[PDB]
Design a protein around this ligand. Structure first.
Ligand SMILES: CCCCCCCCCCCCCCCCCC(=O)OC[C@H](CO[C@@H]1O[C@H](CO[C@H]2O[C@H](CO)[C@H](O)[C@H](O)[C@H]2O)[C@H](O)[C@H](O)[C@H]1O)OC(=O)CCCCCCCCCCCCCCCCC
Ligand code: CLA
Ligand code: CLA
Ligand code: CLA
Ligand code: CLA
Ligand SMILES: CCCCCCCCCCCCCCCC(=O)OC[C@H](CO[C@@H]1O[C@H](CS(=O)(=O)O)[C@@H](O)[C@H](O)[C@H]1O)OC(=O)CCCCCCCCCCCCCCC
Ligand code: KC2
Ligand SMILES: CC1=C(C#C/C(C)=C/C=C/C(C)=C/C=C/C=C(C)/C=C/C=C(\C)C#CC2=C(C)C[C@@H](O)CC2(C)C)C(C)(C)C[C@H](O)C1
Ligand SMILES: CC1=C(C#C/C(C)=C/C=C/C(C)=C/C=C/C=C(C)/C=C/C=C(\C)C#CC2=C(C)C[C@@H](O)CC2(C)C)C(C)(C)C[C@H](O)C1
Ligand SMILES: CC1=C(C#C/C(C)=C/C=C/C(C)=C/C=C/C=C(C)/C=C/C=C(\C)C#CC2=C(C)C[C@@H](O)CC2(C)C)C(C)(C)C[C@H](O)C1
Ligand SMILES: CC1=CCCC(C)(C)[C@H]1/C=C/C(C)=C/C=C/C(C)=C/C=C/C=C(C)/C=C/C=C(C)/C=C/C1=C(C)CCCC1(C)C
Ligand SMILES: CCCCCCCCCCCCO[C@H]1O[C@H](CO)[C@@H](O[C@H]2O[C@H](CO)[C@@H](O)[C@H](O)[C@H]2O)[C@H](O)[C@H]1O
Ligand code: SF4
Lengths: 176, 160, 61, 180, 176, 153, 42, 74, 171
C-alpha cells in the first residue's frame, strides 16, 4: 500500500515491487501512463550507454590507443577531433547493434533488455541472475547520474574528470 | 562579438548617449535652477546616463545603428536576453493557466457553475491562486494520472 | 438504458455527439426515437432536450 | 457574544477558543473566508521563522563564522556580503525541507487532506519534549505567543535598521534620533 | 560468559556460536548485516593482515634478486614493476573467484551455506581433529584481530618515521 | 459558502486518495515522525541516528587533518596526499585521494578535530565596548530619553 | 459587510478591474524602482 | 528589422493557411451545420436560426482568406 | 513540599530516590527533559568538572617535563591553545570521542531503562561494593562542588591571568 522509496506516499499501482530494481519510486507516476515494459527497456539501455560512457570518460585519461594518442584527454575535445570517418564507423557499429534491439522491441517479446547477449554464461544461476539484474539496473542509474555530471563538468572546466579533480577547480566561474 | 560589437565600446552608442543628454540639457537651459522643471530635467538626465551605463556594463552587443541587439539563439552568454525572461514568463503563464483550469473544474462541480463563473467564489479562487506555484509537477501529475487529457470518444466532434 | 441514466450520444449530426445526458423517459409505444435525453449544455438553438433512438445512445459507467 | 480582545466587536464565529492564543482577535474576519487550520499553520510558520530571524540578527552581530564574507555586524549588509552560492544553497534546502516536511502536500487544496495532519504539526519533535500532555498546552501557548512577539520584533528590527543604518544593539547603545 | 562491555547488553545476534565472541558489538552491525558475511570479512581481513605483518618484517631485511629494495616496506610497493603489481592483483582476483566458486556477492556467497571463512584450504590437514579445530578457530580469529591492529600501526608508523618497524624500534625518535 | 484553504482536495474537486495512512507515534532524532515500514523505527531509530553521528564525528577527526605527516626531516611536516605518485595507472601518476572528497585547503578553511581551527575560528565581537545603559560615554537610547526630558527649548 | 454587497464585489467585472489594476500597479512600481530593464541581469 | 518583418510574414502565412484549412476541413460539416455538403460550396448562409450563420461556407472561408492573402503579400 | 525550597511544591519528575535529589528544581527542567537524560548529563558534567578542577590545581603545583617546553609556561586555556597547536589536545579529543561513541550507546540503553544513569560498571578496585548509595551521594556532591570550583577557577584565570593557587597566593 505504501511506497518503499517514499514511506509516506502510497505505492504506485503498476509498481508492485516484483520487477527488478523496484522500490516503489515513482513520485510523478510515469508508470501509470507509459508502458512499463518499454520504460524498463529504456532504463536498461540508458544505464548500459551511461556505464560505458562513464568508463570511457575516464579511461583515456589513464591510457589512450596509440592511434588516438594526440586526441585530448577532454572527452568532448576528443569527440570534436576524431573526425567524420571514425564517427561514421562507430555510428554504423552502433546501428548494427541497435538493429537487434529494433527487432526485439517491434517484432518480438522478451524480458526487458534481453538481447541474448550472455557469452560467458554468468546468468544461469537464478540467485546470481537476480543479483546481477538488480546490480545492472542500479549501476546503470549511478552511471547515468555520474556521466551527466561528468559531461557538465567537462563543459565548465574544459578538462577531463581526473584532471579537474587533481587541479581542484571544482567550482564554476559562470556559464562557458 | 557574435556578429556585432560590445555596446560598452561603441562610438554609435556613445553618440546616442551624447545626443540624448544634449537634448535634455537644451531643454533644461530655459528653466531656472531649483524649479520643478529644472529638477525634473536633471533627473531625466541622470536616468538616461544610468540607463546607458548599465546597458554598457550588461554586456549587450550593439550594431552600427548604436542600439543594443539581442542574441536569442540559445547561447548561454546571452541567456538573460531571452531565455531566463522566457522561463519567468512560462512560469507565470503556467501558474495562471493551471489555477484557471482548477477553478473551472471546481465551478463545474457546483450547484450553479454559470453563477460561479460570473459571480466568483473568491475564497476558492484564492485557494487555487495559491496552489498555482508548483503547477509544473501538478500538471505532470494530472497528465500521468490521466485526469488532464480526455479520451477521443468522450469529446464532441462535428461530422465529417 | 433506463430512466434517470447517463447515456452518451452516438448521433453524428447531434450537438451532443459523444457527450453524456440524462434519460428522462423512454416511450415503449413504438415511435422512431423513443428515448428522451436531457443535457446540461444548451445547443445552438437553445434546446437542452432531444429525442434519440436506442441505437444512438450508450450507457456510461 | 463579544470578542474578549476587542469588546465592542462581536466574537469571531470561526474562532471557538480551541486553538492556543485564541482571544477572539479577528476584527477583519479573515477566519470567515480562510480555514483556521491554514491560518494557524501560516501563523506558526511565520512565528517560527521570525523567532529564528530575531535570534540570528541579534547573535550574528556578536558572533560570526570565520571569514571576511561572514564578518558583518550589520544584518542587511550580511545579506549581501555572505557567499551568494551559500545563500542559494540555503534557498534550495528550505525548498526541500518544505516539500519533505509537508509530505508532498504543500498546496491549499491538499495540505490537510490527511485527517491526522494538524495545523502546524510537521512531525518535528527530535527530543520528544511535546509528549507530556500536562505541559503540551503550555508549550503550545508559549510557541504561539513567542511567534507573535518575534514577528513584531523582527519587523521592528528590520525597519529600525533601514532607518538608522546600524545594527540593533549598536543602535540602542549609540542612539541617534531620526533627522530627515 | 563475560561481556566485553559490561554496561551494554549482549547483542541479540551474537549467541556465542562463532569463535572469539565476547558479545562485542556496541554499534550493532550484526543487527543490520548478515553475521556470516561479517565473519567472512573479519577472517579475510585478519588473514591478509597476518600475511602483511610478516611481509613488513621480512621485506625490510630480505629483498628478492629481481626487485630493487626501497627504504621501507611501504616504499617497496612503489619501487616494484607496475605490471608485476597488476599480475598479483589479477591472480588474487582469480583466487578469490575460484575459492568462492564465482559466488562473490552477499546475495550468493553463502547460497551453499558454507561456514564463514571456510574456503576448503587445509593442505597439511591441520584441521582434521575437532577440538583442535575449535581451539585453532579461536587462535585464528584472535591472531587476525591482533594482526589487523598491528598492521595498521606498522603501516602508519612506517609512513611517519620513514623507517622500518625494527629500524624505528632500534632508533626511536619522538615525533616532537 | 465555501471556506477557502481547507486543505481537503475533495472540497476543491481535486484528486485525492480514499484511505489516508494513519500516523504512528515514533520519532528518530535527526528524522521525522510519520508513516514508516515495519521495523523501520527499531532498525533505524534514534539510537541508530545518534550512534551513526558519533561514528561520523570520530571519522571526521582524522579526515579534518588528513595528510601525510612525516618526521624524517626532524620536524612534523604535513604533505598533501596528492603528492604521492601511484604506479600502474598510465598517465595518471597522481590520483584522487581524500582531499578530493574534502577540499578544505582549496577554500582556505583550517579544519580541525573540532570543526573550526586556529586560522578559521569563530569570531566573537563584544557589542558593548565601553558603553553603559545610562550616564556613559556612548549616547544610548535611555540617554536620549533622559536628555529630551531635561531639554531646554 | 452585507453579503449581497460582497457578492457584487465578487462579480466578474469588478474582480477583473481590481485584479488588473493591481497587476498594472505591480508592473508600474517594478518599472519605477527598477527601470529600463531590457534584460535579466547576468 | 528583417527579423521582425519576417515574423510578420510568418503570421500572415499562418493566418491565411488557418482560414483556408478551416474552410476546407469544415466544408463538409461543422457542429453548427453538420450537413453542409448537402448545401454545397458557395451557399449564402443557413439563416439566423442557431444564433446566426453568416459566412458559414467554404466559399466564405476563401473570401476571407483573400483579404488575409492580400494583407500578407502587401 | 520541596526539602530544599520549602515554599515550592516538590517537582513531580523528582521522586527523591536518585542520589542528590533534594527536590531542587524550581524552574522545572525535569518536567521538560527526560530525567534519565538529565541524570546522565549531571553525572557526566560532575566527572569532567572534577577532573578539570583537580587538573587545574595539579597543573599549578606541577608540570610534566616536555609539556612545559611545548607550552612555553602557558597555563589553563593558554596551555590548551598551545597544545592544540602542538597536537596533544587532538589526541585527547580523539580518544575522548572514541569513549563517547560507547557513551552514546550507553545513553540510549539508559533511555531504554536497561542501564542506570552514569553506571559504566567501572569499579576495578571494588570501592563501590560496601554502600553504593553512600558513594553515589559522595560522587554527586563532589561533582557539583567541582563544577562550581572549575567555574570559579576558569573565571578567576580570565580575570587575572593567574591559576587557582597562584591567584590565592597573590590576589
Ligand atoms: C520584566 C520583569 C523584570 C524587571 C526587573 C527590573 C526592575 C527594575 C529595577 C531596575 C533595574 C535596572 C536594570 C538596568 C540594568 C542595566 O542596564 O544593565 C547594565 C549592567 C551592565 O553592567 C554595568 O556595566 C557598567 C558599564 O559601565 C559603563 O556604564 C556605567 C553606567 O552605565 C558608567 O558610565 C561606567 O563609567 C561606564 O564604563 C559597569 O562597568 C559594570 O559593568 C556594571 O555596573 O548590567 C549588569 O551589570 C549585568 C548583570 C547581568 C544581568 C542579570 C539580569 C538577569 C538576572 C537573572 C538571573 C540569571 C542571571 C544569570
Ligand atoms: C533554429 C534552430 C535552433 C534551435 C532549435 C536551437 C536550440 C538551442 N540552441 Mg541554438 N543555435 C542555432 C539554432 C538553433 N538553436 C544557430 C543557427 C546558432 C548559430 C548562430 C546557434 C548557436 C547556439 C549556441 C552557441 C548555443 C546554442 C544553444 C542552444 C540550446 C540552448 C538551451 C540548452 O542548451 O538547454 C540545455 C538544458 C537542458 C537540456 C535542460 C535544463 C534543465 C534545467 C531547467 C536547467 C538550444 C537547444 C546552447 C547549447 O548549449 O546548445 C546545446 C549554446 O551554447 N545555440
Ligand atoms: C512582457 C512580455 C510578454 C508579454 C506581455 C506576453 C504576453 C502574452 N504571451 Mg507571452 N511570452 C513572452 C513574453 C511576453 N508574453 C516570452 C519572453 C516568451 C518566451 C518564453 C513568451 C512565450 C509565450 C508563449 C509560448 C505563449 C505566450 C502567450 C502570450 C499571450 C497569452 C498568455 C496567456 O494567456 O497567459 C495565460 C495562460 C494561459 C491561458 C495558459 C495556457 C498558455 C500558457 C502560455 C502555457 C504555459 C505552459 C506550457 C506548458 C508551455 C508550453 C510551450 C510550448 C508549447 C512552446 C499574451 C499576449 C500565449 C499565446 O500567444 O497564445 C496564443 C502562448 O501560448 N507567450
Ligand atoms: C550536498 C552537499 C553539500 C556540499 C558538497 C556543499 C558544499 C559547499 N557548501 Mg554547503 N550547504 C549544503 C550542502 C552542501 N554544501 C546545504 C544542505 C546547505 C543548506 C543548509 C548549505 C549551505 C551553505 C552555505 C550557506 C554556504 C555553503 C558553502 C559551501 C562551500 C563550502 C566550502 C568549504 O570549504 O567550506 C568548509 C567549511 C566548513 C566545513 C564549515 C562548516 C560550517 C557549518 C555552519 C557547520 C561548498 C561549495 C559556502 C560557500 O558557498 O562558500 C563560498 C557557504 O557560504 N553551503
Ligand atoms: C599493536 C599495536 C600497536 C603498538 C604496539 C604501537 C606502538 C607504538 N605506536 Mg602506534 N599505532 C597503532 C598500533 C600500535 N602502535 C595503530 C593501530 C595506529 C593507528 C593507525 C597507530 C598509530 C601510530 C602513530 C601515528 C604513531 C604511533 C607511535 C607509536 C609508538 C608510541 C605510541 C604511544 O603513544 O604509546 C602509547 C601512549 C599512551 C598514552 C597509551 C596510554 C609505539 C612504538 C608513534 C611513533 O612511533 O612515534 C615515533 C607515532 O607517531 N602509532
Ligand atoms: C530555487 C528553489 C527551487 C529549489 C527547491 C526544490 C523544492 C521543490 C519542491 C517541489 C514539491 O514540493 O513538489 C510537491 C509535489 C506534490 O505534487 C502533488 O502531489 C499530489 C499527490 S502527492 O502529494 O504526491 O501524495 C498530486 O495529487 C497533485 O496533483 C500534485 O500536485 O510532490 C510530488 O508530487 C512529486 C515530487 C517530485 C519528487 C522528485 C523531486 C526531486 C528533487
Ligand atoms: C601472484 C603473483 C604472480 C603470479 C601467480 C605470476 C604468474 C606468472 C605466470 C604463470 C601463471 C607466468 C607465465 C608469469 C610470467 C611473468 N611474470 Mg609473473 N606472476 C606473479 C607476479 C609477478 C610479478 C610481481 C612480476 C611478474 C613478472 C613476470 C614476467 C616478466 C618479467 C619481465 O618483465 O622481465 C613474466 C614473463 C615481472 C614483470 O612483469 O616485470 C615487469 C614482475 O615484476 N609476475 N607470471
Ligand atoms: C554483459 C556481460 C558482459 C559484460 C560487460 C561489461 C563490459 C560490463 C561493463 C560495465 C561497466 C563498464 C560499468 C560501469 C559503471 C560505471 C559507473 C557506475 C560510474 C559511475 C561514476 C560516478 C558515480 C561518478 C562520478 C564522478 C563524477 C560524476 C564527478 C567527478 O568529479 C567525481 C566522480 C568520478 C566520482 C560480458 C562481456 C562480461 C559478457 C557476460 O556474459 C555478461
Ligand atoms: C521546538 C523544538 C526545539 C527547538 C527550538 C528552538 C530552536 C527554539 C528557538 C526559539 C527562539 C529563537 C525564540 C526567539 C524568540 C524571540 C523573540 C520573542 C523576540 C522578540 C523581540 C522583540 C519583542 C523585540 C524587539 C526589539 C525591537 C524590535 C526594537 C529594538 O530596539 C529593541 C528590541 C530588540 C527589544 C528543539 C530543537 C529544542 C527540539 C525540540 O524537541 C523541539
Ligand atoms: C572511578 C574510580 C576511581 C577513580 C577515580 C578518580 C580518578 C577520581 C577522581 C576524583 C577527582 C579528581 C575529584 C576532584 C574533585 C575536585 C573538586 C571537588 C574541586 C573543587 C574545587 C573548588 C571547591 C574550588 C575552588 C576554588 C575556586 C573556585 C577558585 C580558586 O581561585 C580558589 C579555589 C581553589 C578555592 C578509582 C581509580 C579509584 C577506581 C574505583 O574503582 C572507581
Ligand atoms: C549534443 C551535445 C550538445 C552540447 C553538449 C555536448 C557537446 C556535450 C553534446 C552532448 C551532450 C549530452 C550527451 C548531454 C547529456 C546530459 C546528461 C546525461 C545530463 C544528466 C542530468 C542528470 C541530472 C540532472 C540528475 C538529477 C538527479 C537528481 C536531482 C536526483 C535526486 C535524488 C536524490 C538526491 C535522492 C533520491 C531521489 C532522487 C530524485 C533520485
Ligand atoms: C559533493 C558533490 C555534489 C554533486 C552535486 C553538485 C551539483 C551542483 C553543484 C553546483 C556548483 C556549486 O556551486 C558553486 O558555485 C559558486 C559560483 O559562484 C561558487 O562560488 C565560489 O565557490 C568557491 C568557494 O566554494 C570559490 O573558490 C569560487 O571562486 C567562488 O565562485 C560556490 O563555491 C558554489 O555555490
Ligand atoms: S445576415 Fe447573415 S444570416 Fe442574416 S441573411 Fe444576411 S447572411 Fe444570412
Amino acid at each position: 500500500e505504501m511506497s518503499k522509496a517514499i514511506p509516506f506516499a502510497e505505492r504506485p499501482a503498476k509498481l508492485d515491487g516484483k520487477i527488478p530494481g523496484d522500490v516503489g519510486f515513482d513520485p510523478l507516476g510515469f508508470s501509470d501512463y507509459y508502458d512499463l515494459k518499454y520504460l524498463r527497456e529504456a532504463e536498461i539501455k540508458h544505464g548500459r550507454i551511461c556505464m560505458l560512457g562513464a568508463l570511457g570518460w575516464l579511461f583515456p585519461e589513464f591510457a589512450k590507443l596509440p592511434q588516438f594518442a594526440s586526441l585530448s584527454t577532454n572527452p568532448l575535445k576528443a569527440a570534436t577531433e576524431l573526425g567524420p570517418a571514425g564517427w561514421a564507423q562507430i555510428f554504423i557499429f552502433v546501428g548494427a547493434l541497435e538493429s537487434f534491439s529494433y527487432e526485439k522491441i517491434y517484432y518480438g517479446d522478451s524480458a526487458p533488455g534481453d538481447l541474448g547477449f550472455d557469452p560467458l554464461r554468468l546468468g544461469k544461476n537464478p540467485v546470481s541472475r537476480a543479483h546481477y539484474e538488480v546490480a545492472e539496473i542500479k549501476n546503470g542509474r549511478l552511471a547515468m547520474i555520474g556521466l551527466g555530471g561528468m559531461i557538465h563538468h567537462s563543459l565548465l572546466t574544459k578538462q577531463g574528470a581526473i584532471e579537474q579533480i587533481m587541479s581542484q577547480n571544482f567550482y564554476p566561474s559562470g556559464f562557458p | 562579438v557574435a556578429g556585432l560589437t560590445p555596446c560598452k565600446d561603441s562610438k554609435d552608442f556613445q553618440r546616442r548617449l551624447d545626443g540624448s543628454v544634449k537634448k535634455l540639457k537644451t531643454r533644461l537651459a530655459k528653466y531656472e535652477k531649483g524649479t520643478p522643471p529644472a529638477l525634473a530635467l536633471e533627473k531625466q538626465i541622470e536616468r538616461t546616463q544610468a540607463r546607458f551605463e548599465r546597458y554598457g556594463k550588461a554586456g549587450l552587443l550593439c550594431g552600427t545603428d548604436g542600439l543594443p541587439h539581442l542574441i536569442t539563439d540559445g547561447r548561454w552568454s546571452h541567456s538573460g536576453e531571452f531565455v531566463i525572461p522566457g522561463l519567468f514568463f512560462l512560469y507565470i503563464a503556467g501558474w495562471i493557466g493551471w489555477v484557471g483550469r482548477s477553478y473551472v473544474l471546481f465551478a463545474r462541480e457546483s450547484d450553479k457553475p454559470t453563477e460561479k463563473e460570473i459571480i466568483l467564489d473568491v475564497p476558492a479562487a484564492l485557494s487555487f491562486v495559491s496552489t498555482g506555484f508548483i503547477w509544473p509537477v501538478s500538471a505532470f501529475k494530472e497528465f500521468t494520472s490521466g485526469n488532464l487529457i480526455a479520451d477521443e470518444s468522450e469529446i464532441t466532434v462535428s461530422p465529417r | 438504458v433506463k430512466r434517470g441514466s447517463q447515456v452518451r450520444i452516438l448521433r453524428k449530426e447531434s450537438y451532443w455527439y459523444q457527450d453524456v445526458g440524462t434519460v428522462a423517459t423512454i416511450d415503449t409505444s413504438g415511435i422512431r426515437y423513443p428515448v428522451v435525453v436531457r443535457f446540461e449544455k444548451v445547443s445552438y438553438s437553445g434546446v437542452n432536450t432531444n429525442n434519440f433512438s436506442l441505437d444512438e445512445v450508450v450507457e456510461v459507467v | 457574544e463579544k470578542s474578549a480582545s476587542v469588546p465592542f466587536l462581536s466574537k469571531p464565529e470561526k474562532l471557538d477558543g480551541s486553538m492556543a492564543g485564541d482571544v477572539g482577535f479577528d476584527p477583519l474576519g479573515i477566519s470567515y473566508f480562510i480555514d483556521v487550520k491554514w491560518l494557524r499553520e501560516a501563523e506558526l510558520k511565520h512565528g517560527r521563522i521570525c523567532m529564528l530571524a530575531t535570534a540570528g540578527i541579534l547573535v550574528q552581530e556578536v558572533i560570526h563564522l570565520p571569514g571576511p564574507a561572514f564578518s558583518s555586524k550589520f544584518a542587511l549588509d550580511a545579506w549581501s556580503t555572505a557567499p551568494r552560492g551559500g545563500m542559494v544553497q540555503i534557498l534550495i534546502a528550505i525548498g526541500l525541507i518544505e516539500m519533505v516536511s509537508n509530505r508532498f502536500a504543500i498546496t491549499a487544496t491538499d495540505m490537510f487532506a490527511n485527517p491526522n495532519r494538524k495545523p502546524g504539526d510537521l512531525g518535528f519533535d527530535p527530543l520528544s519534549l511535546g509528549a507530556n500532555p500536562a505541559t503540551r498546552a503550555k508549550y503550545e501557548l508559549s510557541e504561539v505567543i513567542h511567534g507573535r512577539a518575534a514577528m513584531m520584533g523582527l519587523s521592528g528590527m528590520i525597519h529600525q535598521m533601514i532607518v538608522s543604518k546600524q545594527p540593533v544593539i549598536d543602535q540602542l547603545l549609540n542612539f541617534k534620533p531620526v533627522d530627515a | 560468559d563475560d561481556l566485553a562491555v559490561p554496561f551494554l547488553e549482549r547483542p541479540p545476534m551474537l549467541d556465542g556460536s562463532y569463535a572469539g565472541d565476547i558479545g562485542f558489538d556496541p554499534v550493532g552491525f550484526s543487527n543490520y548485516f548478515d553475521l556470516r558475511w561479517l565473519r567472512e570479512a573479519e577472517l579475510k581481513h585478519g588473514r591478509v593482515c597476518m600475511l602483511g605483518v610478516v611481509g613488513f618484517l621480512v621485506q625490510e631485511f630480505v629483498t628478492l634478486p629481481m626487485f630493487s629494495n626501497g627504504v621501507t616496506p611501504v616504499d617497496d610497493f612503489f619501487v616494484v614493476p607496475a605490471t608485476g603489481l597488476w599480475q598479483i592483483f589479477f591472480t588474487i582476483g582469480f583466487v578469490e573467484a575460484f575459492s568462492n566458486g564465482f559466488k562473490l556477492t552477499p546475495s550468493d556467497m553463502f547460497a551453499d551455506d558454507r561456514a564463514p571463512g571456510d574456503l576448503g584450504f587445509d593442505p597439511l590437514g591441520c584441521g582434521k581433529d575437532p577440538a583442535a579445530l575449535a581451539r585453532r578457530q579461536l587462535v585464528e580469529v584472535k591472531n587476525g584481530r591482533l594482526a589487523m591492529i598491528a598492521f595498521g600501526g606498522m603501516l602508519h608508523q612506517q609512513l611517519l618515521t620513514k623507517q622500518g618497524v625494527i629500524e624505528q624500534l632500534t632508533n626511536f625518535k619522538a615525533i616532537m | 459558502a465555501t471556506v477557502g484553504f481547507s486543505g481537503v482536495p475533495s472540497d476543491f474537486c481535486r484528486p485525492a486518495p480514499t484511505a489516508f495512512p494513519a500516523e504512528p507515534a515514533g520519532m528518530t532524532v535527526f528524522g521525522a515522525r510519520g508513516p514508516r515500514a515495519e521495523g523501520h523505527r527499531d532498525k533505524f531509530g534514534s539510537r541508530h541516528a545518534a550512534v551513526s553521528l558519533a561514528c561520523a564525528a570520530l571519522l571526521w577527526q582524522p579526515i579534518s587533518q588528513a595528510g601525510m605527516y612525516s618526521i624524517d626531516s626532524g620536524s612534523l611536516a604535513k604533505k598533501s596526499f596528492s603528492e604521492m605518485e601511484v604506479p600502474g595507472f598510465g598517465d595518471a601518476k597522481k590520483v584522487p585521494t581524500i582531499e578530493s572528497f574534502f577540499p578544505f585547503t582549496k577554500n582556505g578553511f583550517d579544519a580541525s578535530p573540532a570543526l573550526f581551527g586556529k586560522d578559521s575560528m569563530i569570531v566573537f565581537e563584544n557589542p558593548l565596548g565601553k558603553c553603559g545603559a545610562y550616564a556613559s560615554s556612548c549616547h544610548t537610547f535611555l540617554d536620549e530619553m533622559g536628555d529630551m526630558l531635561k531639554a531646554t527649548p | 459587510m452585507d453579503s449581497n454587497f460582497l457578492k457584487y464585489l465578487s462579480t466578474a467585472p469588478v474582480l477583473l478591474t481590481v485584479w488588473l489594476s493591481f497587476t498594472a500597479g505591480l508592473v508600474i512600481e517594478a518599472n519605477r524602482f527598477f527601470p529600463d530593464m531590457l534584460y535579466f541581469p547576468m | 528589422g528583417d527579423f521582425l518583418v519576417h515574423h510578420a510574414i510568418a503570421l500572415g502565412l499562418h493566418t491565411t493557411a488557418l482560414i483556408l484549412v478551416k474552410g476546407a476541413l469544415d466544408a463538409r460539416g461543422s457542429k453548427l451545420m453538420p450537413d453542409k455538403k448537402d448545401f454545397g460550396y458557395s451557399f449564402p448562409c443557413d439563416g439566423p436560426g442557431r444564433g446566426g450563420t453568416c459566412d458559414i461556407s467554404a466559399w466564405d472561408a476563401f473570401y476571407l482568406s483573400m483579404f488575409w492573402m492580400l494583407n500578407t503579400i502587401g | 513540599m520541596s526539602p530544599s525550597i520549602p515554599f515550592l511544591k516538590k517537582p513531580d519528575a523528582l521522586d527523591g530516590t536518585a542520589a542528590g535529589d533534594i527536590g531542587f528544581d524550581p524552574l522545572g527542567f525535569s518536567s521538560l527533559a527526560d530525567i534519565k537524560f538529565l541524570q546522565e548529563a549531571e553525572i557526566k558534567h560532575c566527572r569532567i568538572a572534577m577532573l578539570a578542577a583537580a587538573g587545574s590545581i595539579a597543573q599549578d603545583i606541577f608540570t610534566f617535563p616536555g609539556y612545559s617546553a611545548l607550552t612555553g609556561g602557558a597555563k589553563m586555556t593558554a596551555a590548551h591553545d598551545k597544545l592544540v597547536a602542538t597536537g596533544t589536545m587532538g589526541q585527547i579529543l580523539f580518544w575522548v570521542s572514541f569513549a563517547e561513541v560507547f557513551g552514546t550507546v550507553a545513553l540510549f540503553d539508559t533511555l531504554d531503562g536497561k542501564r542506570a544513569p552514569g553506571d559504566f560498571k567501572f569499579d576495578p578496585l571494588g570501592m563501590g561494593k560496601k554502600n553504593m548509595a553512600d558513594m553515589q551521594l559522595k560522587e554527586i556532591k563532589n561533582g557539583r562542588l567541582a563544577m562550581l570550583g572549575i567555574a570559579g577557577m576558569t573565571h578567576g584565570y580570565f580575570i587575572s591571568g593567574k591559576g587557582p593557587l597562584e591567584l590565592l597566593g597573590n590576589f
